Amino acid sequence: RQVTIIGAGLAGTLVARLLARNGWQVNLFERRPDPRIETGARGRSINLALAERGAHALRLAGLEREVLAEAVMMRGRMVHVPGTPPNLQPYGRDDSEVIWSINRDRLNRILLDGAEAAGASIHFNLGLDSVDFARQRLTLSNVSGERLEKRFHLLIGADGCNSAVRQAMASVVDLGEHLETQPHGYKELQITPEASAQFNLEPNALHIWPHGDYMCIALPNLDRSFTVTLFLHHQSPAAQPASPCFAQLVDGHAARRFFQRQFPDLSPMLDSLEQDFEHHPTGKLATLRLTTWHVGGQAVLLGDAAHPMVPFHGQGMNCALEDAVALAEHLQSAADNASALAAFTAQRQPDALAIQAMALENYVEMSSKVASPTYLLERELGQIMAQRQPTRFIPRYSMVTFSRLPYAQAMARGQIQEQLLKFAVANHSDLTSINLDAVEHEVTRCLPP
Ligand SMILES: Cc1cc2nc3c(=O)[nH]c(=O)nc-3n(C[C@H](O)[C@H](O)[C@H](O)COP(=O)(O)OP(=O)(O)OC[C@H]3O[C@@H](n4cnc5c(N)ncnc54)[C@H](O)[C@@H]3O)c2cc1C
Ligand SMILES: COc1ccc(S(=O)(=O)Nc2nc(-c3cccc([N+](=O)[O-])c3)cs2)cc1OC
Ligand SMILES: Nc1ccccc1C(=O)C[C@H](N)C(=O)O
C-alpha cells in the first residue's frame, strides 16, 4: 500500500527501493539537500566498511554491482605498531573473504538513484518536526522556515541516530530507552594519495594504529587516499587525570604534538592534520537500546534510528541494510502493518542487541597493541579448531563480518566457543601442552553443525 519514510540515508533509501519494487506507493522525506547536484566541493569523503552482510542486502535490491564498482577491496587488517614490521592479518584462513571500502556519499547517491528508478518519490529539504498519531498527520519544515502538513498511513523512521520519528513515538509510548554513553569521541582526518604512495601504505587493507585508551583507523579510497579516524576520550577520567583527551588538544598544534609523540609512524602521513582537526567537528558515540521499535501499525524505526551503536565492529550500515531487507520482507508477507511491524521487531531486536554488545567488545581487541598470553593462546587454538571443523568452529569476527548468520546466533556461538577455548588454555603456557584431538572432540561435542 502506502508508506511515508523519513530519512534518505542508507536504511531509508534501500527500504524505499524494495517497497517500491514490490509495488508500494512510497514517499521519502529528507532533511538535507539532494546530494546528486554537482558542485565545486571535494566533500566530507567518509569511508564505510561494507561486509558480506551489507553486500547481500544490496544484492537483493539489485544494486550490488553498482556499489562494488567504486569499492576498494580490503583483503586483511594491517596493524601498525612502531618498531614492528606492519603485519597484515588476512581475512579468513584463505582469501576469498573480503571487506569493501565504499565512500558513504557514493553509496547514498547510488541508493537514491535506485530508489527513484523503482518508483519512489524523494523530497529533499524537508525535516520531520512532529507527528500527530491520532489524526495521522506529519509536520515537516524547510530551513526557509515554512511548515508543511502531510497525512500518512505507515511511517518509517529511518532518520538516523537522533531520529525525530523515535522522539515523536516516545511522546505517545514508552520506548524503555537506556542510553549507554561512550567516553570516546572521534575525529576525521585524511591521508592524501601523495602521502599514501610515498609511504607505501597498502591501499588494499584496513589499517589500525592501536594505542590502548585511544587509536586510529584507516580505510582507503579509489584515489588511494585514506580516510582516518581518531578515537580518543573527550575528557581524561578522574583516576588518570593526565591521560590524552580531546580537551587537551585545543588546536592543530597541540594535535600535531599529540600525533608526533603518540603516533610517530602515522603522524608524517597526516599532512593536513592541523586543518582537519580544527574544521571537522569532534563526533560523539553512544549505544542506545529500546524495548519497542513500533507504534501499532503506524510507525516503525530501523537502522540507527532504532539502535545506535559504537562503530568498533564496522557494522552499523551493514546492520541498517539488513534491517531494510527484513522490514520490507515483513511488510510484504503480513496480514497488516501491525503484524508486520511487531514481527519485524521480534526478529531484528535480538540481532541489534547482539551486534551492539559485540561492537562494544571489539574495542579492546582492536585497541591493545600487545594481546595477553591468554587471548593469544585462545586465538591460536581457535584458528586450529577453525581449520579442523569449519562447519562448527567459525571465529566470531568471521560469523559477524564474512557471513550472514543472524547477529544473535553469532553471539551465542561465540559464547560457547570462547568458553571452550578458555578452559582448554588455562594452566597451559602454549599449544605444546594442549592435546588438539581432545579439543576437537569437545568442539564437536559442544557445537552443533
Ligand atoms: C565514525 C563512524 C564510523 C562508522 N563506520 C562504519 C562502518 O565502517 N561500517 C558500517 O557498516 N557502519 C559504520 N558506521 C555506522 C553507520 O554509518 C550507520 O550505522 C549508518 O549510517 C546508519 O544508517 P541509517 O540509514 O539507519 O542512518 P543515516 O545513514 O545517518 O541516515 C538517516 C538519513 O537521516 C536523515 N535525517 C536525519 N534527521 C532527519 C530529520 N529530522 N528529518 C528528515 N531526515 C532526517 C539524515 O539526514 C539522512 O538522510 C560508522 C559510524 C560512525 C559514526
Ligand atoms: C570475547 O572474546 C572472544 C570472543 C569470541 C571468540 S571466538 O569463539 O569467536 N573464537 C575465535 N575467534 C578468533 C579469531 C581468529 C583470527 C582473527 C581474529 N580477529 O578478530 O583478529 C579472531 C580466534 S578464536 C574468541 C574470543 O577470544 C577472547
Ligand atoms: N570501520 C570501522 C570504524 C571504526 C572502528 C572499526 C571499524 C571496522 O572496520 C571494523 C572491523 N571489522 C574490525 O574488526 O575492527
Q: Ligand nearest 124 Cα, by number?
A: 1
CA distance linking residue 233 with residue 244, whole number of Å: 7
The residues, any chain, with a CB within 8 Å of residue 219's CB and separated by 6 or more, are: 47, 48, 49, 72, 74, 101, 206, 207, 226, 227
Residue 18 one-letter amino acid: L
CA of 161 to the centre of ligand 1 (A): 7
Q: Parse the chain into domains and list their residue ranges.
A: 1-371, 372-449
CA distance linking residue 113 with residue 109, whole number of Å: 6
Residue 362 annotated as lining a ligand binding site: yes
CA distance linking residue 251 with residue 257, whole number of Å: 10
* Ligand 1 contact via 320 beta carbon (within 6 Å): yes
Element (H, E) at 150: strand 147-151
Count the Cβ atoms, other than its own, within 10 Å of residue 389.
16
Q: At what angle do helices 10-21 and 52-60 cross, to 10 degrees?
A: 30
* Ligand 1 contact via 160 beta carbon (within 6 Å): yes
* Ligand 2 contact via 313 beta carbon (within 6 Å): no
Q: DSSP 3-state assignment of 38?
A: coil
Q: Ligand nearest 402 Cα, by number?
A: 3
Among residues 364, 356, 378, the alpha carbon closest in space to that of 428 is found at: 378
Contact 49, 91 (CB under 8 A): no
> Ligand 3: which of 79, 313, 358 to mutate, judged by most atoms within 8 Å of the beta carbon?
313
Residue 397 annotated as lining a ligand binding site: yes
What is the third-level CATH fold of 1-371?
FAD/NAD(P)-binding domain (3.50.50)
CA of 317 to the centre of ligand 1 (A): 7
CA distance linking residue 270 with residue 219, whole number of Å: 14
Residue 158 annotated as lining a ligand binding site: no
Strand partners for 130:
139
CA of 315 to the centre of ligand 3 (A): 8
> Ligand 1: which of 31, 105, 307 to mutate, judged by most atoms within 8 Å of the beta carbon?
31
CA of 17 to the centre of ligand 2 (A): 36
Backbone dihedral region for residue 353 (phi beyond 0: left; psi -120 to 50: alpha; all else: beta)? alpha
DSSP 306: T
DSSP 48: E
Exposure letters 112-144 (e unless 16+ CB within 10 A, then b)? bbbbbebebebebebbbeebebeeeebebbeee
Q: List the resolution, Å.
A: 2.3
Q: At what angle do helices 10-21 and 316-333 cross, to 10 degrees?
A: 30
* Ligand 2 contact via 418 beta carbon (within 6 Å): yes
Q: Which long-range contacts (CB under 8 A, 24 or more apart) does 249-254 make?
A: 249/277, 251/277, 251/278, 252/277, 252/278
* Ligand 1 contact via 215 beta carbon (within 6 Å): no
CA of 394 to the centre of ligand 2 (A): 9
Among residues 433, 436, 334, the alpha carbon closest in space to that of 386 is found at: 436
Q: Ligand nearest 412 Cα, by number?
A: 2
State the method.
Answer: X-ray
Strands, sheet with 2-6, edge to edge from the N-terminal-most edge strand: 121-123, 25-29, 2-6, 155-157, 299-301, 294-295
CA distance linking residue 112 with residue 223, whole number of Å: 23
DSSP letters for 332-381: HHSSSHHHHHHHHHHHHHHHHHHHHHHHHHHHHHHH-SS--HHHHHHHHH
Nearest Cα residue to atom 26 of ligand 2: 418
Give the cell for residue 375. Answer: 587471548
SS3 for 176-219 is CCEEEEEEEEEEEEEECHHHHHHCCCCCCCEEEEEECCEEEEEE
